[PDB]
Design a binder for this molecule. Structure first.
Ligand code: CL
Ligand code: CL
Length: 162
């Protein structure tokens, strides 16, 4: 297991434009296209991103292409965020994958606000952080996914994805 497989499990893979859990235009392996209610807008974004007229449909290779850009960018944003970097740096490999997963799903900003849990993580107080993480909109909305991520932080293993 690794971050790529982890995320592929959590986000799925769809070749036609679709609405995510929040109702936003998405494609591929959880590649957000736009937050606008317009399918025209998202198509336009899709075309810009792929570099061709897609008509709202990409190939599997194109989806992995976006995925390959998206994963590293997530990491890069964490390393640039003053709130996140120190947590990420204190963590072990498996647990960093859990943080990236969150950042990938909700963005830096989304995550930068889990202050209290981040602090707990940094302190390596696993069970407590796990508890605190669950007290969130995130958990109430995507409980199954949140649970997998939470187990990962709590245990430091890939047990939840296996
Ligand atoms: Cl892009
Ligand atoms: Cl879920």
């Amino acid at each position: 297991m690794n971050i790529f497989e982890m995320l592929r499990i959590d986000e799925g893979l769809r070749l036609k434009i679709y609405k995510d859990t929040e109702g936003y235009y998405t494609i591929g392996i959880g590649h957000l296209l736009t937050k606008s209610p317009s399918l025209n807008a998202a198509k336009s974004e899709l075309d810009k991103a792929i570099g061709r007229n897609t008509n709202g449909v990409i190939t599997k290779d194109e989806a992995e292409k976006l995925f390959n850009q998206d994963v590293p960018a997530a990491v890069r944003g964490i390393l640039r965020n003053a709130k996140l970097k120190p947590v990420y740096d204190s963590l072990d490999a498996v647990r960093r994958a859990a943080l990236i997963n969150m950042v990938f799903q909700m963005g830096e900003t989304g995550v930068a606000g889990f202050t209290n849990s981040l602090r707990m993580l940094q302190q390596k107080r696993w069970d407590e952080a796990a508890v605190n993480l669950a007290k969130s909109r995130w958990y109430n909305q995507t409980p199954n996914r949140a649970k997998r991520v939470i187990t990962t932080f709590r245990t430091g293993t890939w047990d939840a994805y296996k």
